[PDB]
Paper text:
Enzymes of the vanillyl alcohol oxidase/p-cresol methyl hydroxylase (VAO/PCMH) superfamily are found across all kingdoms where they perform a range of metabolic functions. These flavoproteins share a conserved FAD-binding domain and a more variable substrate-binding domain that enables interactions with a range of substrates. One of these, the 4-phenol oxidases/dehydrogenases, catalyzes the oxidation of para-substituted phenolic compounds.
Among the proteins of this unexplored clade, we chose the enzyme from [name] for experimental evaluation. To pinpoint structural differences induced by Pro151 mutations, we crystallized VAD and solved its structure. With 46% sequence identity and a root mean square deviation of 0.89 Å for the Cα atoms, its structure closely resembles that of VAO. Conserved features include the dimeric arrangement, a large chamber at the subunit interface, a constellation of active site Arg and Tyr residues, and the substrate binding mode in front of the flavin si side. Conversely, no tunnels are present in the wild type and the dehydrogenase mutants where the flavin re face remains fully shielded by residue 151 and Trp153. Specifically, the re-oxidation of the dithionite-reduced enzyme is 52-fold faster than that of the substrate-reduced protein (kox of 14000 vs 27 M-1 s-1).
Numbering used by the authors:
A (entry chain A), B (entry chain B): 2 to 519
Write the structure that this text describes.
Amino acid sequence: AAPLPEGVSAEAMSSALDRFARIVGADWVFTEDKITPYEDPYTISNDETEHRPYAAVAPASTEEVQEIVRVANEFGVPLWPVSRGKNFAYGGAAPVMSGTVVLDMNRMNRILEVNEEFGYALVEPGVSYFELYDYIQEKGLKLWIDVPDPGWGSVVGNALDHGIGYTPYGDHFAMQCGMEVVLPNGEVVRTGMGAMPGNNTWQLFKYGYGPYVDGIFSQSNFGVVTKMGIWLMPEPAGYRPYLITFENEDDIETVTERLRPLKVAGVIQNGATVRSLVLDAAITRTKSQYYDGDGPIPPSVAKTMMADLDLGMWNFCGALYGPPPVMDTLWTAIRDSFADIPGVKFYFPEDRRHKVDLLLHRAETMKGVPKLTEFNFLNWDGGGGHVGFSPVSPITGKDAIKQYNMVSSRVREYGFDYMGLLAIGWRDLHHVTVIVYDKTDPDERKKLDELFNILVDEAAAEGYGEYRTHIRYMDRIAKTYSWNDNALWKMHETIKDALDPNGILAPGKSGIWGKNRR
Amino acid sequence: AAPLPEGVSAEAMSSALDRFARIVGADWVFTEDKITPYEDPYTISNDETEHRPYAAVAPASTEEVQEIVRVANEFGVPLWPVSRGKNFAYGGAAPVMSGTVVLDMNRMNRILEVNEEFGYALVEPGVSYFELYDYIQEKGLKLWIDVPDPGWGSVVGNALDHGIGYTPYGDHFAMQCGMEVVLPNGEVVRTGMGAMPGNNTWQLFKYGYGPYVDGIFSQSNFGVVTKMGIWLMPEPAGYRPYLITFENEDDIETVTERLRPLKVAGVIQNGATVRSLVLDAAITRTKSQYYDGDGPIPPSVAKTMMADLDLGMWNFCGALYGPPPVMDTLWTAIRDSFADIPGVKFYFPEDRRHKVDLLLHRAETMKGVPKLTEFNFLNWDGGGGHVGFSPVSPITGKDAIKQYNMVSSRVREYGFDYMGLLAIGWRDLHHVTVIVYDKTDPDERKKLDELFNILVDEAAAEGYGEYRTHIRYMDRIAKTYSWNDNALWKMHETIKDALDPNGILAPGKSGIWGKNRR
Ligand SMILES: Cc1cc2nc3c(=O)[nH]c(=O)nc-3n(C[C@H](O)[C@H](O)[C@H](O)COP(=O)(O)OP(=O)(O)OC[C@H]3O[C@@H](n4cnc5c(N)ncnc54)[C@H](O)[C@@H]3O)c2cc1C
Ligand SMILES: Cc1cc2nc3c(=O)[nH]c(=O)nc-3n(C[C@H](O)[C@H](O)[C@H](O)COP(=O)(O)OP(=O)(O)OC[C@H]3O[C@@H](n4cnc5c(N)ncnc54)[C@H](O)[C@@H]3O)c2cc1C
C-alpha cells in the first residue's frame, strides 16, 4: 500500500477523500483492493513504493472536475489526470510521484459531435478509439479515424501525449483543434474559436485570436482537459496497403536515403515504418517456436524466420490513398526508388501466401481500424512488459545505421532481442527501440533499467533526444533538453507556479515540479 | 511629437535611452524626426496622441536584445518588438500604447541555414521574403518559399502574426518549427529539439519534449523571437495555375458549397481565394473610367467592368501542383465541381487576353515568387490607406452569401466600395473585407472607424470572430472572445504576469495588458 505524499498529513488526505466523495458520490472514489488496475502493469522499479497511487476519484462532468480541483487546492492534495489510463509502456495509469490521487475520466466518454461534411469530432476523455470508430460505423459516416496499434486508449489522452498512428492523420495532436481545459485554480476555459460565444468554428480553425496555447496542455500538468476536437480524414476514394522487404541488415542505410525525398515531399502519404525482422515476425510467432536458448536469436534462425514468413531483415509497410490514377503514380515513384536494391521484394496483400500475416494486420491500422490482437511483440519472449526508446534524428542513411548499430549491440549484449523500427513522420526520423522483458523477475528489471539509461545517454551524445517516455524516466528525459542551464524548463516552472501555485496537478509530469516540491 | 508612457518619468526614459545606446551604439537609437518611419503609414485615429512611439532601438544580435530587455525591466520602459515592421494594414511598425519604444530587429537579418534535403530554413527576424527567395536562387536550391501578396515583409514577423500565403505551405505559423526566444526577463530559450545541445533536428520536429509552447510567442507579448525555423515546400514536378469566374453575385453561395468537400479532402492543394470584381478592378483600373459620381459604383457599371477586365462577379484562382498525371486527375475533379453553374468560365494563363491580369499576377504568388508591381489600391479613388476585416466562419454557401450581404450593404452605406474575398485554408472560410480609403482625410477616417466597429460587432454577434487585426482594434477583437466572462484572456493575463511581471513587452498586443496597466 502506498505512502502519503510529503506535505499531506493523514487528516488533510482523508478530509479531501470525503469531500471528493460528496462531489462525485461515494461509489466513484476508489481505495484499497480497488486501486490495483491503476498501478503500472509493466513495473521497472524494484523499490515497490515508487509510482503508487493513493486513491482514484472518478468524476462524470466538467463541473465536478472543477470542485475536485478546488478541494485539491484547499487541502494541498495533488491529482494525476488520465483520460483512460491505457498508457502502457509509459506507466499506464500510475503517477510519477507516490501518493498523488488519480483523477480518472473514463466516465466522461460522451462523443459530443461528429461532423461528416467538415470532417471532425468533438469528444470527451473517456471516448476510446473503439467507441469513436463504432459510432462512425453505426451512423455510416464516411470518415476515418487515426489509430494506435493495438488501438487501446483515449482519442484525447493519446493525442495529449503526442501519440501517433498510421494514416495521413498520424500526428494526433497536429490534428487537434479546440479544447476545453479546467485550470489548476478550478476555472474553465475554451481555446481557439471556442472562446467566441455562438461560434460554429471551434473545430474548424485552430488559432482563434492571439497567443496559441493548445500545445501547453499537451505532455503537461498545466490543466485538465475535459473536451477536445480532432480533425478526421474523409473516406478516400481508394486504398492500397503494401509491404517492401529487404534481405540485408545493412540495407537500412540506403533505404533511409531513398525514403527521405519521398517523405519530405509528401509522396508517401502516411508515416513510413521500416521494421526489423523480429519486431514484425512477432506479430504472428513467438521466440520459443524458432529458438530455445535464453539469449537473442542467432543469424541462422533469422534466415529461417525470413524464408518461412516472407519477411526481410527490414520491412517497410506503407499505404497509398485517394483515386487509382493517383495511387498508380505514387506507386510508380515509390517502387522505382527501391527496385535496384539486391534482394528487394514488393508485396500487395494478395501476394501474401499466409492468411495470418504482417501486411494483413498492418493494413487494418493503415486504414484507421482499431484492432486488439492478443498476439503482438509482448508475447515474443513468453510475455511480460515493454518499454520503448523513440528519439529524434535527421532522415539519413548514416543516422539510421548508426542508431541501429549502437542499440542492437547493447540490447543483444544484455540478452534481449533487437526489436527496432525506423519511423518517419514528415521531416523527422525516429529509431524506435522496443525491449520486451519479464516484469516479474527483479534481475531482468535491473538489466532493463540500466540498458535503458545507457541508450538514452549514448543517443543524447549523438544529438538524438526522446519525445515521449515512461513516468519513471520523465525527469531523465527533461534533463536532456538542457541548453543554457535548463532555460526551457525554467520557463515551464515559471508557468507552472502561475497556473498551479499550490502544485496539485500531476507533479513531475514531463519533469515539471512546481516551487513547493522543487 | 509624442508623450511618455504613464508611470515613466523623463529621468527613467532618459537613462534607459543612454544604456540602450551603450548596448547597441549611439547611431542605432532613434528619436526626434527619425521616428517618422515607425508611425502607422495608414492612420485611422483622428486623435494625434495615440499609437505614437517614443523612440526606436535597433539591436545587432540576440544578446544585445537580451541586454536591452534587462535595462527595460529596471527602468519600467516598454518595448514594441518588430521584425521588419512592414505590417502595413495592421498599423505597421507602431505600438498600441504611445510612449512604447520600438524594438526594431531589422538589422538582425542573417539567413542562418537553408537546407535542401530536409526542406527548411533558419532565419533571423530581419530576413525579408525577398532576401530568402534570392538566397535560395543564388544557391540553386530546389525549394519554394510561401509569400504574401505583395511580399515586402518578414518571414518571421508575418508568421508570428498568423500570416497566410498562396501555396500549400500557405499557413505560415503552421509551417514554423523551432525558435529562439528572449523572455520578458532577459533570459533566452530554445524550443523543440533546440533545447537539446548538439541536436541536428531543431527544424525537423516541432514538439521536442513536454509542453508545446511555440504558439504562445505568436500574436503575443510573451517574448521576443530572435530565431525561427520554417519548413519549405520542395520544388514540385509540375505547376498549373487556373482561374474560374462566376457571372452572378449570388453564385458565391453554391460555389462555397462546392469548395467545402474539395478543400477538406485536400483536392484543392493550396488556399482557395474567391475575389469580388471590384477588389481586382481597383488594383488594375480607376473608378472614373467606369463611373463619374462621388458615391459607390451602381449595379449598372458592373456588367461593363466585367467585359472590360474579362472577370466575373466572383473570381476563384488556385493552382494544381504535382506530376502532370496527378494534376489532370485533380483538375477533372475541380472543373466537374463547377461545370454546371450558369455563366461559369474556365481560364488557364494563355487564355488571358490581358497580360496585366489577376491570373498571371497570381500565378507568381501561388508558386512562391514575391513581387512588387507599380499597382495597388490607389488610383481607384485617390485612396492610399487600407484596412482588412477577416473573420472565421464555416465553409457554407449560407455563411458566405450571408457575410457578403452583411458587409457590402454596410460598406456601401458608409461610402466605400464593396471589395471582398472568400478564402478557405483547410476547414476555415473567411470572408475578407478590404476597405480602401483616404489616410489624409479626417472625415473619411472617422467614417472608417464607425464602419469597422459595426462590422466587428455584427460578425461577432453571429459567431464569426477575427484572427488578425490592426493595432487600433486589438482590445475590441479580444473582447469578442468572451466565453465564461473572458476566461481565456484571464488565463493569458495570468501567463503575462508570470513571464512579464514589470510589463515591458508590447503592452496591448492582442489585448494583453498585465498587472501594472489593468
Ligand atoms: C504494444 C503497444 C503498442 C503501442 N502502439 C502505439 C502506437 O502505435 N501509437 C501510439 O501512439 N502509442 C502506442 N502505444 C502506447 C499507448 O498504449 C497508446 O498510446 C494508448 O492508446 C494511449 O493511452 P491513453 O489513450 O489511455 O492515454 P492516457 O493514459 O489516458 O493519457 C496519457 C497521459 O497524458 C496525460 N493526460 C491524458 N489525458 C489527460 C487529460 N484529459 N488531461 C490532462 N492530462 C491528460 C496524463 O499525464 C496521462 O498519463 C503502444 C503501447 C503498447 C503497449
Ligand atoms: C496591400 C497589402 C497586401 C497584403 N497582403 C498580405 C498577404 O497576402 N498575406 C499576409 O499574410 N499579409 C498580407 N498583408 C499584411 C502585411 O503587409 C504582411 O503580413 C507583412 O508580411 C507583415 O509585415 P512584417 O513581416 O514586417 O511584420 P512585422 O510588423 O515585423 O510583425 C507583425 C507583428 O508581429 C509581432 N512581432 C514581429 N516580430 C516579432 C518578434 N521577433 N517577436 C515578437 N513579436 C514579433 C509584433 O506584434 C508585430 O506588430 C498585406 C498588407 C497590405 C498593405
